[PDB]
Design a protein around this ligand. Structure first.
Ligand code: HEM
Ligand SMILES: [Mg+2]
Length: 386
């Protein structure tokens, strides 16, 4: 705990002042859990691109199956796996996915506009539409959305460095649920092939480029990333529009401002706080040398609030230089988000659909949260459109 008390409710609600104290006093902090925590932008940016840091040799504990996915592999296995999916998430591919996302979003807003204008924008929009888009990509009908959201969040608790024993058991149970669910999806597609990403994983398996477990857990990974951080971008952006009507107006009236707005939502409340790596050689980080064999937590959320890069960093300003494009919310280096183009498209579709159809959005109740040391989480976001 000490300077980063992961399970403390105050820290989870607002960790930014804790990051600021670390940046000032301990840029490389040896945390009691056995992590070296790295809080400055300059150091995070260099390390996340350093090819000597490993994910494959990290102990993921109950989340070990992530080692059967690109997220849990070092090169060359990383390259092998990532090359299978690269063509599915290019700007060209995203043009197709955008039509699906747009239709889903527009259908939700049609129900809203025909009713009383109220919506839980979390379960009823950001989750629903990102999940349905992911299922279209895979080539399946949408089912088990609630379980998939819940069990992804459960796994997230163990990926956070504050995870405990009870959370670990729920995590292994979640992976068993996912593997059973996904094996049925794959069996169905072997029996009746389509043209979706699941079909592409099956083809890769049949060509000897992936194992059966790599197929199953890679589908898991895309279920999780297809909705988890992107729904926070959407949720937090909608919440900001309820608080800041000038942001609603700018999104609608200034198309050139839109990347800057997306970027500033991501910078101010980074959906995933950190990425973890293992050193494989003595690693110099400023005035500290970390031995080989040590786990590093690269605090992207702290980097994103570092005043050496972002002036007045705790203030939301969508008009920042270079559209706030220096943020590290999508990571960087070998593992830099494979879904960035899709995520930015999905968020843009939601925000543009809202501001082109309604005059404003307001809160219709108190939001609910489930923040952790690792994940920012809006669980319920009751709004009214007009
Ligand atoms: C705002 C939304 C998102 C944010 C902030 C985000 C952030 C990140 C970050 C920080 C990582 C790096 C993890 C590391 O270095 O350990 C990552 C990896 C990845 N993300 Fe995203 N992500 C988002 C949306 C998506 C979406 C919609 C997809 C869907 C394809 C996706 C797919 C991935 C994949 C597959 C990886 C692993 C890449 C690799 O290991 O080479 N992400 N994401
Ligand atoms: Mg329509």
């Amino acid at each position: 705990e000490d300077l980063l008390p992961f399970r403390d409710p105050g820290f989870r609600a607002d960790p930014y002042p804790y990051y600021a104290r670390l940046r000032q006093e301990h840029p490389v902090y040896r945390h009691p859990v056995g992590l070296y925590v790295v809080s400055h932008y300059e150091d995070v940016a260099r390390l996340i691109r350093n090819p000597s840091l490993s994910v494959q040799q990290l102990d993921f504990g109950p989340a070990a199956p992530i080692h059967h996915t690109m997220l849990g592999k070092d090169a060359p296995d990383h390259t092998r796996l990532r090359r299978i999916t690269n063509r599915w998430f290019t700007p060209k591919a995203v043009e197709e996915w955008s039509k699906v996302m747009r239709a889903c979003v527009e259908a939700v807003l049609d129900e809203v506009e025909k009713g009383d204008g109220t919506l839980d924008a979390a379960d009823g929009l950001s989750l629903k539409c990102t999940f349905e888009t992911t299922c279209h990509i895979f080539g399946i009908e949408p089912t088990e959305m609630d379980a998939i959201q819940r069990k992804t969040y459960e796994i997230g608790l163990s990926l956070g460095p504050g995870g405990n024993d009870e959370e670990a058991r729920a995590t292994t149970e979640a992976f068993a649920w996912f593997a059973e669910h996904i094996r049925r999806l794959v069996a169905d597609k072997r029996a009746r092939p389509g043209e979706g990403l699941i079909d592409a994983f099956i083809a890769a398996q049949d060509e000897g480029r992936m194992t059966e477990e790599e197929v199953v857990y890679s589908i898991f990974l895309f279920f999780a990333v297809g909705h988890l951080d992107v729904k926070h971008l959407i949720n937090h952006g909608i919440w900001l529009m309820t608080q800041r009507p000038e942001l609603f107006a700018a999104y609608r009236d200034e198309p050139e401002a839109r990347p800057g707005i997306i970027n500033e939502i991501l910078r101010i409340d980074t959906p995933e706080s950190m990425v973890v790596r293992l050193t494989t050689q003595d690693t110099v980080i400023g005035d500290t040398t970390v031995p080989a064999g040590e786990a590093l937590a690269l605090l992207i959320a702290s980097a994103n609030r570092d005043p050496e890069v972002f002036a007045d960093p705790d203030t939301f300003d969508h008009t920042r230089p270079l559209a706030a494009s220096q943020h590290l919310a999508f990571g960087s280096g070998m593992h830099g988000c494979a879904g960035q183009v899709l995520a930015r498209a999905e968020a843009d579709i939601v925000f543009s659909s809202i501001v082109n159809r309604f005059s404003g959005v307001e809160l219709a109740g108190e939001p609910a949260y489930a923040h952790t040391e690792f994940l920012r989480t809006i669980t319920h976001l009751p709004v009214r459109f007009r």
